[PDB]
Design a protein around this motif. Structure first.
Motif, mmCIF file in Angstrom:
data_model
loop_
_atom_site.group_PDB
_atom_site.id
_atom_site.type_symbol
_atom_site.label_atom_id
_atom_site.label_comp_id
_atom_site.label_asym_id
_atom_site.label_seq_id
_atom_site.Cartn_x
_atom_site.Cartn_y
_atom_site.Cartn_z
ATOM 1 N N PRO A 1 -72.483 -29.777 5.372
ATOM 2 C CA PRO A 1 -71.629 -28.740 5.367
ATOM 3 C C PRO A 1 -70.624 -29.008 4.289
ATOM 4 O O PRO A 1 -70.513 -29.692 3.427
ATOM 5 C CB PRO A 1 -70.950 -28.776 6.741
ATOM 6 C CG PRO A 1 -71.554 -29.830 7.355
ATOM 7 C CD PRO A 1 -72.203 -30.738 6.378
ATOM 8 N N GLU A 2 -69.968 -27.857 3.776
ATOM 9 C CA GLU A 2 -68.894 -27.758 2.711
ATOM 10 C C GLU A 2 -67.930 -28.815 2.861
ATOM 11 O O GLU A 2 -67.321 -29.086 3.795
ATOM 12 C CB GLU A 2 -68.252 -26.295 2.462
ATOM 13 C CG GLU A 2 -69.212 -25.129 2.374
ATOM 14 C CD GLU A 2 -69.767 -24.649 3.695
ATOM 15 O OE1 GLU A 2 -69.218 -25.196 5.027
ATOM 16 O OE2 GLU A 2 -70.531 -23.902 3.698
ATOM 17 N N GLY A 3 -67.554 -29.631 1.890
ATOM 18 C CA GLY A 3 -66.730 -30.609 1.727
ATOM 19 C C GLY A 3 -66.919 -32.003 2.164
ATOM 20 O O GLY A 3 -66.418 -32.928 1.725
ATOM 21 N N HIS A 4 -68.226 -32.109 2.947
ATOM 22 C CA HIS A 4 -68.672 -33.308 3.155
ATOM 23 C C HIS A 4 -69.304 -34.022 2.068
ATOM 24 O O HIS A 4 -69.595 -33.590 1.084
ATOM 25 C CB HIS A 4 -69.568 -33.185 4.378
ATOM 26 C CG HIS A 4 -69.045 -32.725 5.648
ATOM 27 N ND1 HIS A 4 -68.898 -31.456 5.793
ATOM 28 C CD2 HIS A 4 -68.986 -33.398 6.706
ATOM 29 C CE1 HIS A 4 -68.601 -31.346 6.911
ATOM 30 N NE2 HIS A 4 -68.561 -32.280 7.716
ATOM 31 N N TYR A 5 -68.990 -35.277 1.954
ATOM 32 C CA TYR A 5 -69.367 -36.361 0.856
ATOM 33 C C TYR A 5 -70.008 -37.604 1.386
ATOM 34 O O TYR A 5 -69.796 -38.156 2.345
ATOM 35 C CB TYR A 5 -68.548 -36.221 -0.090
ATOM 36 C CG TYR A 5 -67.370 -37.209 0.333
ATOM 37 C CD1 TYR A 5 -67.230 -38.565 -0.116
ATOM 38 C CD2 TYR A 5 -66.147 -36.730 1.061
ATOM 39 C CE1 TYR A 5 -66.262 -39.553 0.317
ATOM 40 C CE2 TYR A 5 -65.154 -37.662 1.345
ATOM 41 C CZ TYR A 5 -65.156 -38.966 1.089
ATOM 42 O OH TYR A 5 -64.134 -39.699 1.319
ATOM 43 N N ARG A 6 -70.494 -38.418 0.442
ATOM 44 C CA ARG A 6 -71.159 -39.701 0.830
ATOM 45 C C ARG A 6 -70.503 -40.721 0.041
ATOM 46 O O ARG A 6 -70.174 -40.577 -1.022
ATOM 47 C CB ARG A 6 -72.335 -39.929 0.183
ATOM 48 C CG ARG A 6 -73.218 -40.909 0.633
ATOM 49 C CD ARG A 6 -74.644 -40.921 0.142
ATOM 50 N NE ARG A 6 -75.023 -41.407 -1.179
ATOM 51 C CZ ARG A 6 -75.119 -40.504 -2.307
ATOM 52 N NH1 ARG A 6 -75.718 -39.482 -2.197
ATOM 53 N NH2 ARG A 6 -75.399 -41.184 -3.514
ATOM 54 N N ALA A 7 -70.307 -41.845 0.602
ATOM 55 C CA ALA A 7 -69.373 -43.051 0.183
ATOM 56 C C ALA A 7 -70.085 -44.469 0.652
ATOM 57 O O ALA A 7 -70.683 -44.275 1.407
ATOM 58 C CB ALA A 7 -67.795 -42.895 0.575
ATOM 59 N N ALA A 8 -70.116 -45.268 -0.140
ATOM 60 C CA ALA A 8 -70.510 -46.436 -0.160
ATOM 61 C C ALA A 8 -69.511 -47.560 -0.046
ATOM 62 O O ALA A 8 -68.622 -47.717 -1.113
ATOM 63 C CB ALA A 8 -71.687 -46.786 -1.046
ATOM 64 N N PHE A 9 -69.423 -48.448 1.016
ATOM 65 C CA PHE A 9 -68.571 -49.228 1.127
ATOM 66 C C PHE A 9 -69.047 -50.667 1.047
ATOM 67 O O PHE A 9 -70.077 -50.985 1.561
ATOM 68 C CB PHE A 9 -67.880 -49.092 2.852
ATOM 69 C CG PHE A 9 -66.915 -48.009 2.651
ATOM 70 C CD1 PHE A 9 -67.585 -46.700 3.105
ATOM 71 C CD2 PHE A 9 -65.607 -47.826 2.350
ATOM 72 C CE1 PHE A 9 -66.652 -45.515 3.095
ATOM 73 C CE2 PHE A 9 -64.880 -46.757 2.373
ATOM 74 C CZ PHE A 9 -65.357 -45.604 2.878
ATOM 75 N N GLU A 10 -67.997 -51.641 0.788
ATOM 76 C CA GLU A 10 -68.830 -52.943 0.577
ATOM 77 C C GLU A 10 -69.115 -53.620 1.850
ATOM 78 O O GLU A 10 -70.020 -54.353 1.769
ATOM 79 C CB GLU A 10 -67.640 -53.716 0.067
ATOM 80 C CG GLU A 10 -66.591 -54.199 1.087
ATOM 81 C CD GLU A 10 -65.318 -54.868 0.392
ATOM 82 O OE1 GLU A 10 -65.450 -55.399 -0.637
ATOM 83 O OE2 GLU A 10 -64.293 -55.322 0.983
ATOM 84 N N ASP A 11 -68.718 -53.087 2.922
ATOM 85 C CA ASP A 11 -69.212 -53.539 4.246
ATOM 86 C C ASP A 11 -69.722 -52.335 5.374
ATOM 87 O O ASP A 11 -68.598 -51.375 4.975
ATOM 88 C CB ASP A 11 -68.442 -54.564 4.904
ATOM 89 C CG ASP A 11 -69.347 -55.665 5.796
ATOM 90 O OD1 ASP A 11 -70.498 -55.469 5.644
ATOM 91 O OD2 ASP A 11 -68.630 -55.872 6.720
#
Ligand SMILES: [Mg+2]
Ligand SMILES: [Mg+2]
Ligand SMILES: [Mg+2]
Lengths: 63, 177, 49, 40, 46, 282
Positions: free
Chosen positions: B36-46
């Motif tokens: 949906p609008e505004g959602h995004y993907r992030a990668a975290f160290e853990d």
RNA sequence: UGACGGAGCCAGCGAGUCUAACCUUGGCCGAGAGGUCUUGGUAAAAACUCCGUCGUAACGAGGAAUUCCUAGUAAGCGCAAGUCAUCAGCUUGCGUUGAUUACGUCCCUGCCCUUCACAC
């Protein structure tokens, strides 16, 4: 490519800068030249902003 | 992640921006989801948890108000009752207003339950091809009632009160030690 | 404690989970994260062995 | 806001010109870093 | 592009600061320490 | 063989462990040699170590390419297999062919349902020296992993600014002569390790007048790869691009074959460290 | 070389106290914070084998040109994971069913190489 390269040079004495399409019924652009211009224009704009960050005066030329 | 931004165009500005959670896990904004609008993907160290809150630290400029009220007591009639802008505390009292408060912001005592994690489960493929010295003894539960299990007599009454007590005392003793 | 006010050594209290997210559970802090990470690494090491 | 990593470099025309000049200089000097057959 | 500029500026600022901080720490140690050794030798002479 | 490969790796790991232990002793002998030539006195610890001095008489008689490559460095021409991930798109299949033409001694192999342990074991039987696997995203190559047999290393790279040769009109055919190699701006110890991996995919001993040059230029960890064909003119050098263009950034390097996900990590890219942006490792 | 329904039946990867909606209608308790219930809308193994039924504006398998491909290959089918780079407008793994045609030739098109016996 090289055999053509010798042929051209002996007569006289980089095709990867052009993106070409398929003729369905040809050179389409200049990725290198276009990106350099589009990248520099935002550079001088960024240069302009960093000058304007901490100023209130300015020579008001109405000539 | 959701609710950080409102539209994909906003995420565009902050791609690659540094982020972190409450726990201290650092991360990065990778790309904007089309739906949906505004959602995004992030990668975290853990791996992060659902309960975590992801925070982006940003900086917003603040401007100094240009207010100048010279004290001119001599011009007045009283010369000792000059009054200018009132304090925020006084202003609120004059208008009968409460000091703004946020229920989230308040502090509370926090009680932490002891943390415990499940035991280790070896994959059966690895478990099958293990050397004889190191083969894990996993004793299966029994479902068919054993005959001895249907025979044994468990002393009731006076023994029961006299055996629960033993399990009472030893539980205190180990905890004391 | 040399040249330090008792005001400097003031307890900073710890925040709580937001009410809108109360269903999910306790808000993980650094201490509770470190327990999660240590246990996972301990188990993976045995699997690698 | 802070950014975690440098963006991937963009291939401008100036970059290609700089890259081309390095290759031309190496060939003109005839020094190349290549694996050499071991004797015997 | 803004990302590229910021990191270069931040790295340059961090580089100068360390050189400056080391600069003042070293000059204080070199010059002032010399006199302290000079004084201590005079005290030993006394 | 399987017993052969296992024991060889075990001895080699044991050799490394002893060599790390031997590192201190080697320096101790270097000090003794210098002392004898200069006449300078030895340090105290070496002076009282009778065992070392007795050993020195024998060990007075003692005297580059990396260990995995040292055996075959410049002797046996590399054998290269270029493959892809399962169910490749056409563009990746086209790009995999270009990589094959890049290395003179390469062969393209189709990965339809080949299992990775089967893929590596099959290549080890046939004497393959290097295996290359390419990935893609919507017909855009994204990753490249180079796995040296029989026991690694496995180096993984990510591709940016990929420009295949099929994107050109009337490009013609390539030259498959053993090309010259240019490696520019590889300074750190890790950088040499990457040069060592990339260098040995090519055949040794190009002809001095060989007309194909491959350059790997490091510019802030982004290894530019270019292929040029040159003609020596009377007043300089003129070059033409053959392609493909692409930029590689290392993000893993393991002591093992690509199959072994448990192999030790020689180096990895840490992106969430605070000081990540500051230093360039290659 | 269909659709609907029913029946039979076959995998391999994968195990972090960790895994997962949104917007509403109202009741009650509570100083407040909030807690609980109630309520409507929106989003979110397959192939295979057997049996029974029906029945044969745009578009009905994609022009010229161009690209790839030799055995568990091409092609069809689903199931998992998301492993510091890339990826979810998707990427990578896993198993299942599995062919036709060539495996010769330098004729064309390119690239490359050459000019210690016996016997020649
Ligand atoms: Mg296929
Ligand atoms: Mg598929
Ligand atoms: Mg794919």
């Amino acid at each position: 490519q090289l055999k053509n390269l010798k042929a051209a040079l002996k007569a006289r004495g980089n095709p990867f800068e052009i993106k070409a399409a398929r003729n369905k019924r040809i050179a389409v652009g200049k990725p290198g030249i276009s990106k350099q211009i589009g990248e520099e224009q935002r550079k001088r704009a960024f240069e302009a902003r960093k000058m304007m960050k901490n100023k209130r005066g300015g020579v008001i030329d109405k000539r | 992640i959701k609710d950080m931004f409102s539209s994909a165009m906003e995420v565009a500005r902050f791609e690659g921006a540094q982020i972190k959670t409450v726990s201290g896990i650092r991360g990065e904004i990778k790309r904007a989801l089309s739906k949906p609008e505004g959602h995004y993907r992030a990668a975290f160290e853990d791996k992060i948890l659902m309960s975590d809150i992801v925070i982006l630290r940003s900086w917003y400029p603040v401007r100094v108000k240009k207010f100048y009220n010279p004290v001119t007591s001599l011009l007045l009639k009283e010369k000792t009752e000059w009054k200018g802008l009132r304090l925020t505390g006084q202003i609120r009292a004059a208008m009968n207003l409460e000091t703004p408060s946020n229920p989230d912001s308040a502090y509370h005592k926090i009680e932490r339950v002891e943390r415990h994690f499940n035991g280790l489960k070896v994959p059966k493929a690895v478990q099958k091809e293990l050397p004889f010295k190191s083969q894990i003894h996993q004793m299966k539960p029994q479902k068919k009632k054993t005959y001895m299990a249907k025979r044994a007599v468990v002393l009731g009454g006076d023994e029961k009160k006299a055996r629960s007590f033993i399990q009472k005392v030893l539980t205190i003793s180990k905890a004391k030690d | 404690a040399k040249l330090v006010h008792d005001v400097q050594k003031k307890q900073h209290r710890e925040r709580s989970q937001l009410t809108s997210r109360s269903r999910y559970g306790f808000l993980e802090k650094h201490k509770d994260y470190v327990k999660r990470a240590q246990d996972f690494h301990r188990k993976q090491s045995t699997l690698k062995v | 806001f802070d950014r975690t990593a440098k963006p991937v470099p963009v291939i401008t025309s100036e970059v290609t010109e700089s890259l081309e000049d390095m290759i031309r200089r190496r060939i003109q000097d005839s020094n190349f870093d290549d694996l050499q057959r071991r004797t015997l | 592009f803004e990302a590229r500029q910021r990191i270069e500026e931040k790295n340059k600022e961090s580089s100068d600061y360390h050189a400056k901080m080391a600069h003042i720490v070293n000059t204080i140690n070199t010059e002032e320490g010399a006199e302290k050794n000079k004084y201590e030798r005079e005290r030993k002479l006394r | 063989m399987l017993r052969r490969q296992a024991r060889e790796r075990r001895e080699y790991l044991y050799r490394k462990a002893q060599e790390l232990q031997d590192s201190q002793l080697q320096q101790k002998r270097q000090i003794i040699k210098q002392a004898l030539a200069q006449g300078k006195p030895l340090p105290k610890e070496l002076a009282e170590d009778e065992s070392l001095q007795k050993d020195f008489r024998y060990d007075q008689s003692l005297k580059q390419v990396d260990d995995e490559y040292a055996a075959t460095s410049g002797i046996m021409d590399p054998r290269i297999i270029v493959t892809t991930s399962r169910d490749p798109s056409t563009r990746l299949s086209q790009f995999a062919k270009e990589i094959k033409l890049l290395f003179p001694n390469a062969v393209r192999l189709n990965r339809g349902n080949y299992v990775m342990p089967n893929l590596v074991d099959a290549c080890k039987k046939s004497g393959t020296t290097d295996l290359v696997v390419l990935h893609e995203h919507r017909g855009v190559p994204t990753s490249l992993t180079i796995s040296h047999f029989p026991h690694g290393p496995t180096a993984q790279f990510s591709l940016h600014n990929v420009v295949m040769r099929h994107d050109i009109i009337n490009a013609g055919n390539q030259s498959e002569v053993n090309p010259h190699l240019i490696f520019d701006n590889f300074t750190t110890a890790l950088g040499k390790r990457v040069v060592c991996i990339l260098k040995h995919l090519f055949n040794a001993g190009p002809k001095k007048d060989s007309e194909r040059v491959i350059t790997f230029a490091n510019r802030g960890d982004f290894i530019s790869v270019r292929q040029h064909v040159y003609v020596r003119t009377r007043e300089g050098v003129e070059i033409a691009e053959v392609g493909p263009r692409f930029e590689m950034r290392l993000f893993e390097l393991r002591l093992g074959t690509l199959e072994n996900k448990d192999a030790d990590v020689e180096w990895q890219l840490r992106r969430f460290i605070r000081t990540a942006n500051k230093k360039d490792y290659l």
